[PDB]
Amino acid sequence: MEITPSDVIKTLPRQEIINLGQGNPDLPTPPHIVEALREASLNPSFHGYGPFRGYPFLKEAIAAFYKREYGVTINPETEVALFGGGKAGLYVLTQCLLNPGDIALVPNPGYPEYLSGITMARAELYEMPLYEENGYLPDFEKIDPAVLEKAKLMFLNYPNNPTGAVADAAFYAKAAAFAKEHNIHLIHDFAYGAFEFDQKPASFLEAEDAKTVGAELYSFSKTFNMAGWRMAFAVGNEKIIQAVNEFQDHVFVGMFGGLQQAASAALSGDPEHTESLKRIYKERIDFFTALCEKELGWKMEKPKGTFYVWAEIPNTFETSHQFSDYLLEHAHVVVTPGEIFGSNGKRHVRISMVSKQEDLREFVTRIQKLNLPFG
Amino acid sequence: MEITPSDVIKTLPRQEFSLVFQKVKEMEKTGAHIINLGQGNPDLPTPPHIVEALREASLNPSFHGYGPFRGYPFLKEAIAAFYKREYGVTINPETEVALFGGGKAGLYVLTQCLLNPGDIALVPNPGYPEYLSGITMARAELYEMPLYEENGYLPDFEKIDPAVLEKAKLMFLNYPNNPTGAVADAAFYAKAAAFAKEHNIHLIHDFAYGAFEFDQKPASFLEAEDAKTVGAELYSFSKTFNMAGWRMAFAVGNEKIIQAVNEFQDHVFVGMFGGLQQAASAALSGDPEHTESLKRIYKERIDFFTALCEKELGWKMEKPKGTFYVWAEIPNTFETSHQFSDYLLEHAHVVVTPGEIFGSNGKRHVRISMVSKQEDLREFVTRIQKLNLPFGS
Structure with a gap:
């Protein structure tokens, strides 16, 4: 048995x-x-084994990328962590930010793997419905004020899988301000952040108080047709990244230097x-x-x-x-x-x-x- | 907050990690060599x-692009072939093989797929520190199996408090052994498998140093009767092939443990770069x-x-x-x-x-x-x- x-x-x-x-x-x-x-x-x-947290040259590339594309200032020694793909990043982030019995706020519709990391953390899901009439943005006002104290984590995703909706800087300022008031860690899933067709795609980290409440997950998979390569990073709050680093120290030893070099060529290209x-x-x-x-x-x-x-x-x-x-x-x-x-x-x-x-x-x-x- | x-x-x-940090600081300032x-x-x-x-x-x-979530068949077949060639062991590659981004990741995944909160895990003392790390993340209880020099650093199973064996759902063993350099023989593995089945304990054998037994042919835990019945073996590319930095490993064993592994990793992974899987395949058939x-x-x-x-x-x-x-x-x-x-x-x-x-x-x-x-x-x-x-002294 x-x-x-x-x-x-x-x-x-x-x-x-x-x-x-x-x-x-x-x-x-x-x-x-x-x-x-x-x-x-x-x-x-x-x-051989390299640095547990990944090579500095990659973390420097990431910060330079975020300055170039979005005008965001990232301290590379403290605000960057590496993941074997955005799927693994979602999992690690959830384990670092949710205790059993905490509530995770999840969009509906939304990427199905959000629900799954929440499940392995033994947490409760509460849904934020996404309605076309609202431009598939959440109405933070309609969230039951009783769940807000127990709510520890919120997932957001724009450009949006599966709806293709986009969000502008004012939506992200509202989201961060909401997260701040209610002590909710906010994870922005930016896996399609290269692909807003009309406007320049705005990062969650451009908004005031974003780095205070959360972090952005960026995948190499869609931007550079590197889905098979399994590479991603998170950028945001220093405390979030330290926790990630502490988890991953026990689970990994960075990732192949060759991949990291390839990722550095991607970002600076x-x-x-x-x-x-x-x-x-x-x-x-x-x-x-x-x-x-x-x-x-x-x-x-x-x-x-x-x-x-x-x-x-x-x-x-x-x-x-x-x-x-x-x-x-x-x-x-x-x-x-x-x-x-x-x-x-x-x-x-x-x-x-x-x-x-x-x-x-x-x-x-x-x-x-x-x-x-x-x- | x-x-x-x-x-x-x-x-x-x-x-x-703390040492890498300490050393790096020392090398920088001043100039320690x-x-x-x-x-x-x-x-x-x-x-x-x-x-x-x-x-x-x-x-x-x-x-x-995205590959098969559980790995490319060509690698799992190369793994089965390797285990047949090196050891006497027949392995079904469509059901008895799982891939990991290194042995350290393997350990974490196996721990999470096998332990419930409050469960007991049997861990050698001395032993690889990550055994204890995964247990704790699983919120499970640790029970120590002393490894003494007089016993050749093999555990004395009879000495485990019988009251633990019910809540004991997992046991790690590791030969060739980190840190003692001790080795195990076919009889030991037979005895471990026997003991595992007799008390319903999932048995994980860490074979990270399986290439490095000097005076004898290294013996796989899977060579033992009852082995694939109660557990699985973890193999790393790290030491065998100087591939520490490449982050590649696999588990071979009980098809039920493997399916459990597969059900976890489908949601956290989707395998690893196909270039690395071909490189591993060429390491194995080399x-x-x-x-x-x-x-x-x-x-x-x-x-x-x-x-x-x-x-x-x-x-x-x-x-x-x-x-x-x-x-x-x-x-x-x-x-x-x-x-x-x-x-x-x-x-x-x-x-x-x-x-x-x-x-x-x-x-x-x-x-x-x-x-x-x-x-x-x-x-x-x-x-x-x-x-x-x-x-x-």
């Missing part, structure tokens, strides 16, 4: 043909990042690379949503951010799950049912613009042979 | 064929020559060092049966392991690891790693001699 712990058994199975499901970038990592890894790997200094990629996603979104309306009758929002389209399922379907499953079965295409993002996602699917045109057209046309009432 | 979790404020300070025989950090480089495997693999755009030759270097250093230490200091120390570690008694003039090691740092400028880091049975011992070439080991002795301490 092998016995898993309560943590394991209460965790859900992870839910992640034309695949417009997983948000897996299809374009390669830029060549200069690959060359940096290839070159660094020859350096025997990286074959020309921004024109990322803008080009942003242009590619933008053109695919125009292609896709125009062809959907014209050839199917499916009227879709164009997202303000990210490479995701959030579309309403036909009136004749029970749940996003069945609709999703109808498409995989009969049309042989993958979309992500909105339900995995929370109850507020029912009746929507998330569709990822991580395929080239040829696959996006064949998506639409395969679905035409189904003649659904998108009207 | 930033408020760390109770898990963090309840952790020990990582000692290798230090011989560091503390952390077991391999001084020799990763073999070139492993390095080139990574270099070629990184050009493969299939690895630039010629044992590299490893055999690496082993011989470590042994000649141990022979040199312990000889020299007797000759020049009157410091007599038992040669280890495995690992690159020497486990040595501290002078009687010294009160503790820490104040002895602090003294050698400050006065000689040499690092050794205080034994008390490994548990109460390591007070009065230090661990010294043979991770510098002979003439650096000679300078190490030379520096200590200049202190004239009474290494006689």
Whole structure:
């Protein structure tokens, strides 16, 4: 009788043909990042253990990146921690900031792994609904004042998975001011922060009192098509980072020097690379949503951010799950049912613009042979 | 008011971390030159064929995107093949293999996937400090299994209070042993497996130094009857292949423990860079020559060092049966392991690891790693001699 712990058994199975499901970038990592890894790997200094907290040269790159892109001042020796990807960062941050029985404030809809780190910390979730009428921003006023004392952590995510909503500096000032009043650690998930199409994407850390209450998680995965490389960092409050450092001292010994060099080449590289990629996603979104309306009758929002389209399922379907499953079965295409993002996602699917045109057209046309009432 | 979790404020300070810091400060200001025989950090480089495997693999755009969450099949198959070749052990790679970003991460994950709050874990004393770290993060109770020299540092299972065995859900063992250099044989593993099954204890065998038994063929815990029934084995690339910095490891064992591991890591990981997995695959299927030759270097250093230490200091120390570690008694003039090691740092400028880091049975011992070439080991002795301490007893 092998016995898993309560943590394991209460965790859900992870839910992640034309695949417009997983948000897996299809374009390669830029060549200069690959060359940096290839070159660094020859350096025997990286074959052995290095600094537990990661190399200074990477932490210096991170601060310089945050100054260049967002005008934010980051002390690299104290306000930066490294993670093996944003998924691991979310987990570490949650374990460092939540005790069993504390309340975590989580958007609905929202990235499903927020709920999961909260579960391994044995904490209680309280939902902040995201409604289109509010621009998919939370109404902090509608949170039960009784939970606020017990609420220790809040998750926010803009540009937003799965809705593509964006937030401006005034929303972040309000969020931080709210978090301050109620002693809530605020984690901003900036995994799509390269991808706001109209305005320059604003960091949470531009807002007054942001660094006081919280931190920003930045992934390499989407910005630089480095999803496979498993690299991320957090920037923010010095106390948060010290806690992270203390946890990770027992769990890791930094990460391969070659990867860190590659990450340093990514951050200091020309921004024109990322803008080009942003242009590619933008053109695919125009292609896709125009062809959907014209050839199917499916009227879709164009997202303000990210490479995701959030579309309403036909009136004749029970749940996003069945609709999703109808498409995989009969049309042989993958979309992500909105339900995995929370109850507020029912009746929507998330569709990822991580395929080239040829696959996006064949998506639409395969679905035409189904003649659904998108009207 | 930033408020760390109770898990963090309840952790020990990582000692290798506090030392890295101490040393770095010393090297900077003023200009101390230090011989560091503390952390077991391999001084020799990763073999070139492993390095080139990574270099070629990184050009493969299939690895630039998300891969399979639980690892690439080609690696798990290479792991099964390796265990069959080195040890007699048949391993099902689709169900009995899990990948980790290093053995230290493995330990944390296995602890979290196997212990509930209040559960009891059986931990060797002396033992690797991270065993105790993960337990505490799991909010579990620690019970010690003394490792005594007279027993060859193998635990006496019969001596565990039978009242503990019900709440005991986990046991760590570790041979070739850190810090003692002790080794285990097939009979010992059979006895451990027998004992684990008879009391329903998940058994984790840490095989981080499994390449480094000098006088015999190293024996896998999985070679034992009942082994895959009650537990799993942790293997690291760190020491075998001078890949400490690459952060790669795996567990092989009971398919139920592995599924538990997989259910955790699906939510925290999605594997690691495919370039590193191919590099590991090439390490595993590579010629044992590299490893055999690496082993011989470590042994000649141990022979040199312990000889020299007797000759020049009157410091007599038992040669280890495995690992690159020497486990040595501290002078009687010294009160503790820490104040002895602090003294050698400050006065000689040499690092050794205080034994008390490994548990109460390591007070009065230090661990010294043979991770510098002979003439650096000679300078190490030379520096200590200049202190004239009474290494006689």
